[PDB]
Design a protein around this ligand. Structure first.
Ligand SMILES: CCCCCCCCCCCCCCCCCC(=O)OC[C@H](COP(=O)([O-])OC[C@H](O)COP(=O)([O-])OC[C@H](COC(=O)CCCCCCCCCCCCCCCCC)OC(=O)CCCCCCCCCCCCCCCCC)OC(=O)CCCCCCCCCCCCCCCCC
Ligand SMILES: CCCCCCCCCCCCCCCCCC(=O)OC[C@H](COP(=O)([O-])OC[C@H](O)COP(=O)([O-])OC[C@H](COC(=O)CCCCCCCCCCCCCCCCC)OC(=O)CCCCCCCCCCCCCCCCC)OC(=O)CCCCCCCCCCCCCCCCC
Ligand SMILES: CCCCCCCCCCCCCCCCCC(=O)OC[C@H](COP(=O)([O-])OCC[N+](C)(C)C)OC(=O)CCCCCCCCCCCCCCCCC
Ligand SMILES: CCCCCCCCCCCCCCCCCC(=O)OC[C@H](COP(=O)(O)OCCN)OC(=O)CCCCCCCCCCCCCCCCC
Lengths: 171, 459
């Protein structure tokens, strides 16, 4: 068959979000609130293209919008967030329920200094509508022409010509 | 032909709803009425066969076989009502039902327009015949007789089924009326060779061919008298009828494939006739004479000239009447001496003079005395085989010597000489027995006055 078409190594270079998983999980609800739009454009492009190579640029927007999410935490509320992801980082299963006072301090400092509302129980699992200008992929499976089906039956059913025609049976 | 199938079927309530003493009289009377009605099949034309329907037709070949078939049934009922006098009433009605069902299968074996319906009736005639031989036969060897009779026949005919279905798939129809007009020449190949053998060996068995004849002297001597009459008179002629139908399709391969089957016949009618010079059993002598006479019909069909077909169908009808009468005469002695040994009861013209006159007439029609239709068929086969090869007259003429030398030997051994001293149950001839002999011989003699109705589709 054909050559697989991969992007080059310079096409994949982007400033990564070089933080740990507890830093991400501690900031997760405000990330799902504030970084909604490029993330949903990316995941819509990701389920519609069904090909990561056609989803790189939108993905870079994700990696553009996450970092600006953290710098805006780093410029204003670096220390309550630092205590909060440290307390999240202690636990094995990384429980939100073991760290409610640092969560309250972080949410209070964020709501005062930046004006972000933490999403409630039920909001981040909603299915939202996304306004994009990219075209809908007309063939995301790279399929081809389906074969022509067999012709159907039509016409009124006439009786059998001279019956069964089985050797001598005249009916 | 539905005016003959339905009366034959209605003989089943006629034999099962009758009184316990009237079942021979009713079946004899109404089968004689069916035999009188069988003469309406003589509406034959010099160009077209009498074509009744999509299922049944009757040319001038099937019509004499049908008249002989529907005539044989009252004669079998007359022959069979003496040795089934102590019989249970239910088994008596079962025997009459097997004869009725066998007639029903034969009269739409010969009229079957389509060849697989011919096969189904042709092989349906085994089962009532098998039941008659193996149930109402007399000796121990009736079971082996039924096994040989069944397994030569089906071994011959199970290739015939495959060959007929091949013709059905290739031509498109096994209608004999279509196959007269869509017949293609069968070329020289091995496929067509075994096609010919599958088409012919079933009928070669039922004629019988010499070498395949071994089922017959067991099935004739171990059958009862109605069984012996129907195998002699009709059930050998299914092979001749089927050959005359099926050799339409087997041209021109027959003109080099019939050579081994003519030799086997032309020498075999010498052998079996010679066997009749030394047979101690009278019924076996009549059986081997039946093989000897049907060998001429095999030769006449395989050389496929018009005189040969005319002689072969005349010889079939004549041999049917003659051999049925010979088995009835042998039964007339067996019902008195209770043994089929021909040297046992001698000198029986001193004791039964009119029955010896019937023996004399049946022996003269066996030896082809002119102007009987025996001699007409014999003579026309000899003419057409002289046209085939001039040397065949040797094998013909020598046979016509030996056919005399057992026809009169059987007359001299049974009826002449000094009578047996220690046999004294030799009753006078019953009116049933003389009636049976006269109903065999008087149509056979009246057909000399008008033989053109028994000379096939090409008179
Ligand atoms: C106002 C409104 C009302 C008006 C009403 C008017 C009518 C009133 C009456 C209505 C009731 C129906 C009456 C019968 C109608 C006609 C049927 C007929 O004769 O068809 C001829 C039929 C075909 O002949 P045809 O010349 O082509 O056409 C004439 C008709 O137009 C044929 O016409 P068709 O083209 O339409 O026929 C169709 C087709 C035409 O046929 C074909 O296509 C040919 C192939 C048929 C089957 C062949 C099978 C071969 C292998 C098996 C053989 C088995 C053994 C044979 C029998 C042994 C005895 C049991 O037949 C079939 O497919 C059916 C199969 C055969 C059955 C026939 C009916 C029987 C009814 C009574 C049963 C009694 C026992 C019968 C025997 C049992 C075996 C059948 O003949 C045969 O197949 C030969 C056998 C004879 C038929 C049966 C005879 C019926 C009367 C029997 C009375 C005596 C009984 C004694 C006791 C029982 C026996 C021990
Ligand atoms: C359509 C109308 C037709 C009318 C004319 C009839 C046409 C022929 C029909 C059948 C004729 C023969 C039947 C009689 C023989 C069987 C019975 C018997 O034992 O008789 C002795 C018995 C007299 O003997 P008895 O002293 O009372 O006691 C008996 C003895 O104890 C013991 O007996 P025995 O030792 O004294 O006698 C033995 C002796 C033995 O004598 C012989 O065997 C010598 C004669 C045969 C060989 C030499 C001649 C060969 C042929 C040449 C002659 C024909 C062609 C001539 C024409 C010119 C040339 C072409 O038999 C004879 O002499 C019988 C004479 C007739 C023989 C015919 C040939 C049979 C031989 C085998 C086949 C030969 C080829 C076929 C011939 C076909 C002819 C049409 O006869 C009768 O009681 C006669 C009863 C009534 C018979 C009716 C026959 C016709 C029935 C048909 C009914 C339906 C149609 C209505 C017409 C009715 C007409 C009245
Ligand atoms: C009674 C005792 C002896 C019985 C002898 C019976 C007859 C002897 C020959 C029978 C052969 C089998 C039936 C053949 C039917 C022919 C149909 C036909 O058109 O064939 C063409 C076909 C040809 O194929 P085709 O025609 O489909 O091919 C397309 C056409 N061409 C050739 C151009 C490509 O023949 C065959 O396929 C094989 C024929 C020979 C069969 C060999 C096997 C059987 C051997 C003999 C068995 C005999 C009975 C045994 C039992 C004895 C007792 C227990
Ligand atoms: C006695 C018991 C009861 C009766 C049983 C049946 C007896 C009669 C049937 C068998 C008699 C012998 C076989 C038939 C001989 C006549 C036809 C024939 O096959 O001729 C022999 C053949 C001659 O060769 P050729 O003419 O070229 O044939 C080619 C055909 N395309 O020769 C050859 O081609 C060479 C040999 C080939 C193989 C022959 C054997 C198998 C096939 C037949 C079975």
């Amino acid at each position: 068959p054909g050559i697989v078409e991969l992007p080059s190594l310079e096409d994949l270079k982007v400033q990564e979000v070089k933080v740990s998983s507890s830093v991400l999980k501690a900031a997760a609800h405000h990330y799902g609130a504030q970084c909604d739009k490029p993330n949903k454009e990316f995941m819509l492009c990701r389920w519609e293209e069904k090909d990561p190579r056609r989803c790189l640029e939108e993905g870079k927007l994700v990696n553009q919008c996450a970092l600006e999410f953290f710098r805006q935490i780093k410029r204003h509320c670096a220390e309550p967030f630092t205590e909060y992801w440290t307390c999240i980082d202690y636990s094995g299963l990384q429980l939100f329920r073991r760290c409610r006072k640092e969560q309250a301090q972080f949410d209070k400092c964020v709501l005062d200094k930046l004006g972000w509302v933490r999403p409630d129980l039920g909001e981040l699992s909603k299915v939202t509508k996304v306004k994009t200008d990219r075209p809908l992929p007309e063939n995301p499976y790279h399929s081809r022409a389906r074969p022509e089906p067999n012709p159907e039956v039509e016409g009124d059913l006439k009786p059998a010509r001279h019956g069964s025609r089985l050797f001598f049976w005249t009916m | 032909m539905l005016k003959y199938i339905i009366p034959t079927m209605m003989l089943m309530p006629l034999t099962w709803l009758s009184k316990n003493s009237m079942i021979w009289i009713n079946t004899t009377l109404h089968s004689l009425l069916i035999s009188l009605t069988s003469l309406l099949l003589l509406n034959q034309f010099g160009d077209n066969s009498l074509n009744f329907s999509l299922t049944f037709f009757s040319d001038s070949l099937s019509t004499p076989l049908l008249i002989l078939t529907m005539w044989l049934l009252p004669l079998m009922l007359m022959a069979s009502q003496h040795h089934l006098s102590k019989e249970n009433l239910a088994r008596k009605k079962l025997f009459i039902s097997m004869l009725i069902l066998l007639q029903l299968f034969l009269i739409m074996t010969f009229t079957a327009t389509e060849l697989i319906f011919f096969y189904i009736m042709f092989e349906a005639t085994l089962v009532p015949t098998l039941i008659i031989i193996t149930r109402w036969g007399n000796q121990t060897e009736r079971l082996n007789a039924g096994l040989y009779f069944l397994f030569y026949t089906l071994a011959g005919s199970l290739p015939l089924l495959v060959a007929l279905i091949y013709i059905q798939n290739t031509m498109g129809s096994l209608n004999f009326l279509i196959l007269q007009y869509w017949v293609q020449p069968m070329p020289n190949s091995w496929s067509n060779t075994f096609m010919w053998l599958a088409c012919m060996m079933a009928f070669m068995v039922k004629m019988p061919l010499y070498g395949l004849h071994l089922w017959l002297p067991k099935a004739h001597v171990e059958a009862p008298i109605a069984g012996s009459m129907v195998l002699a008179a009709i059930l050998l002629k299914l092979g001749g009828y089927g050959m005359m139908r099926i050799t339409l399709l087997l041209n021109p391969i027959t003109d080099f494939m019939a050579y081994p089957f003519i030799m086997l016949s032309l020498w075999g009618m010498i052998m079996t006739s010679s066997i009749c010079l030394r047979q101690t059993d009278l019924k076996s002598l009549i059986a081997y004479s039946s093989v000897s006479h049907m060998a001429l019909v095999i030769v006449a069909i395989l050389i496929q000239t018009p005189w040969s077909y005319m002689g072969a169908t005349a010889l079939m009808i004549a041999h049917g009447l003659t051999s049925s009468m010979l088995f009835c005469l042998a039964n007339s002695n067996y019902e008195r001496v209770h043994s089929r040994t021909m040297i046992l009861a001698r000198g029986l013209q001193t004791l039964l003079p009119l029955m010896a006159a019937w023996w004399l007439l049946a022996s003269l029609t066996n030896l082809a005395l002119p102007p009987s239709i025996n001699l007409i068929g014999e003579l026309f086969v000899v003419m057409s085989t002289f046209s085939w090869s001039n040397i065949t007259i040797i094998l013909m003429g020598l046979n016509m010597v030996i056919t005399a030398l057992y026809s009169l030997y059987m007359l001299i051994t049974t009826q002449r000489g000094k009578h047996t001293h220690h046999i004294n149950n030799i009753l006078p001839s019953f009116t049933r027995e003389n009636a049976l002999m006269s109903l065999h011989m008087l149509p056979l003699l009246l057909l000399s006055l008008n033989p053109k109705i028994i000379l096939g589709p090409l008179y």
